[PDB]
């Protein structure tokens, strides 16, 4: 009846989000390497193509929501996968799912970026043009040839490009009647109480996603919601 598609649903935020949205009465179609209705590794072009097809086959009448939580962190063995999953794993899926989203009830989507998205300027992001141009092989080569902290480049670079990608889609998605926002998590407890000085439980990310997926955020669109206990504000008080 009310379908919400969730990538990266097996663990962390994706899993916590699935739990919350399921309690809200939604039917979840998850995408992940395991424990998901759609088994897929989004690190390759073919893998996402198949994941997209498998999802749509289950959402012929459309979908009410989309939450893209799949992601890989810095210090991932093969840095090329960080770029593939973090960027294309999100961009290709949201772009292919928009038609189905347009047919849903109060359709909304949330993309999980990262506070890291702001540690680099898009115009000075070594991956920007390649990613924006869909040149996956090139983007993966950039980080695998970066050397020193190529991990941070791959992570912050993909996330920064991802947040911009989402923001540049605001006009089109708005026209389609589908809200699209990102959350930018800070330190999460992935293997109430004031936020400053502690990590967040994955559920604290999920509670914000639920809000962004609900009528309470009916006028929130194209925004990046930072969920980091205040760290970003201390670091960049004049930058927002």
Q: What is the CA radius of gyration of the chain?
A: 17
Q: Is 155 annotated as a binding residue?
A: yes
Judged by CB under 6 A, the chain residues 55 through 114 that form the site for ligand NAD are 69-73, 81, 85, 112, 114
Q: Would you say 1 or 192 has its CB closer to ligand NAD?
A: 192
User: Using CA atoms, how far apart are residues 190 and 12, in angstroms rounded to an integer?
Assistant: 6
H-assigned helices in 169-221: 170-175, 202-212
What is the per-residue DSSP string for 110-122?
Answer: EEE--GGGGSS-G
3-state secondary structure of 92: helix
Q: Is residue 155 annotated as part of the catalytic site, yes or no?
A: yes
- 214 assigned ligand-binding residue: no
Q: Which is nearer to a second copy, 16 or 42 (CB)?
A: 16
| Binding residues for ligand NAD restricted to 19-58, rule: CB under 6 A | 32-33, 40-43
Closest to a second copy by CB, 92 vs 228, is 228
Per-residue b or e along 182-207, where b marks 16 or more CB atoms closer than 10 Å to that residue's CB: bbbbbebebeeeebeeeebebbbbbe
User: Of residues 87, 88, 97, 155, which has the active-site annotation?
Assistant: 155
Task: Provide the token pair at 3.
Answer: 């379908």
- Contact pattern from residue 181 through residue 200 relative to a second copy, giving x for each residue in contact according to CB under 8 A and a dash for the rest: -----x-----xxxxxx--x
Q: Which of 3, 4, 14, 139 binds ligand NAD (CB under 6 A)?
A: 14
Exposed, middle or buried, 113 (CB in 10 Å: 0-12/13-18/19+)? buried
Q: Which residues bind ligand NAD (CB under 6 A)?
A: 8, 10-14, 32-33, 40-43, 69-73, 81, 85, 112, 114, 185-188, 190, 202
Residues with a catalytic annotation lie at 155
Residue positions in the annotated binding site?
8-13, 32, 41-42, 71, 114, 155, 159
């Amino acid at each position: 009846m009310s379908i919400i598609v969730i990538s990266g649903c097996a663990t962390g935020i994706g899993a916590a989000t699935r739990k919350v949205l399921e309690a809200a009465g939604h039917q979840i179609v998850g995408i992940d390497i395991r424990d998901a209705e759609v088994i897929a590794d989004l690190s390759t072009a073919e893998g996402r193509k198949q994941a997209i097809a498998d999802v749509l086959a289950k959402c012929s009448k459309g979908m009410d929501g989309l939450v893209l939580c799949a992601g890989l962190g810095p210090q991932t063995k093969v840095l090329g996968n960080v770029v593939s999953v973090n960027y294309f794993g999100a961009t290709e899926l949201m772009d292919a799912f928009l038609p189905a989203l347009k047919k849903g009830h109060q359709p909304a989507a949330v993309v999980i970026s990262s506070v890291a998205s702001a540690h680099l300027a898009f115009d000075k992001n070594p991956l920007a043009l390649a990613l924006e141009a869909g040149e996956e092989a090139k983007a993966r080569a950039i980080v695998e040839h970066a050397g020193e902290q190529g991990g941070n480049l791959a992570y912050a670079g993909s996330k920064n490009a991802l947040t911009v990608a989402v923001r540049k889609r605001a006009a089109a998605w708005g026209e389609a009647g589908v809200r699209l926002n990102t959350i930018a998590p800070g330190a999460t407890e992935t293997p109430f109480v004031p936020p400053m000085g502690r990590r967040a439980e994955p559920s604290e990310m999920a509670s914000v996603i639920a809000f962004l997926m609900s009528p309470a955020a009916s006028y929130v669109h194209g925004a990046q919601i930072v969920i980091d206990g205040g760290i970003d504000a201390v670091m960049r008080p004049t930058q927002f």
